[PDB]
């Protein structure tokens, strides 16, 4: 409820936020994925990226 609990979280690490764990380190924003690297590694074959070259 507090109108003093949050300052601007506009960019960098604020709005630039994870879409799996809730982390902030290693954020591939390419094609608007917003996934962490490690998670992506174990999921990319389902999202559709592979090891062709």
């Amino acid at each position: 409820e507090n109108v003093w609990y949050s300052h601007p979280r506009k960019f960098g690490k604020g709005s630039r936020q994870c879409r799996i764990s809730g982390s902030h380190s290693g954020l591939i924003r390419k094609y608007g994925l917003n996934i962490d690297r490690q998670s992506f590694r174990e999921k990319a074959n389902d999202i559709g990226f592979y090891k062709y070259r």
Binding site: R19, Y31, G32, K43, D46, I47, G48
Partner: protein, 176 residues
């Protein structure tokens, strides 16, 4: 969506992945295997694979409907635009995820690990594939943790003989 084609495709892929994850989380007892997303301009179809179909359905159509509702809520879809179809896999002993789930269930009930693994291997053999291997890592009722191999038939490891001809599932079991 109106967004770029490439981006749209990526988003769809991500959505699919998310769906898969959800199914893995939720449909443990329901015996989940795999998901497909078919998109027609008016109707979005998701085909779910499972072993205990009645459970997936609910009563008359309890659980599937709720899942559809959830899906609608999540990625913003108008009620009726999305649909679900839960259907059997004709060979349960080929889809790796299903096998993994079965193994997990065996473990949580209180079975011996080795025995369970052997049972799973036997089941796979009965189903009919050109060999399978089971890897069980961690504590095997010991303070020091080890690795296990339960191999039958013959395996492949490198190439495009991997993809399509192989199914791989990693599933972790939490215990006391």
């Amino acid at each position: 969506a109106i967004i770029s084609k490439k981006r749209k495709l990526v988003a769809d892929g991500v959505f699919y992945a998310e769906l898969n994850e959800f199914f893995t989380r939720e449909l443990a007892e329901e015996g989940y295997s795999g998901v497909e997303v078919r998109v027609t301009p008016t109707k979005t179809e998701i085909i779910i694979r499972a072993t205990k179909v009645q459970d997936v359905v609910g009563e008359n159509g309890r659980r599937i409907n709720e899942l559809t509702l959830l899906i609608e809520k999540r990625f913003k879809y108008k009620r009726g635009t999305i649909a679900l179809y839960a259907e059997r896999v004709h060979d349960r002993g080929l889809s790796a995820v299903a096998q993994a789930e079965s193994m997990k269930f065996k473990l949580l009930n209180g079975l011996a690990i080795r025995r369970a693994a052997y049972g799973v291997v036997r089941y796979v053999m009965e189903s009919g594939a050109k060999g399978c291997e089971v890897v069980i890592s961690g504590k095997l009722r010991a303070a020091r943790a080890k690795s296990m191999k339960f191999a039958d038939g013959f395996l492949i490891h490198s190439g495009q003989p991997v993809n399509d001809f192989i199914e791989t599932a990693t599933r972790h079991v939490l215990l006391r």
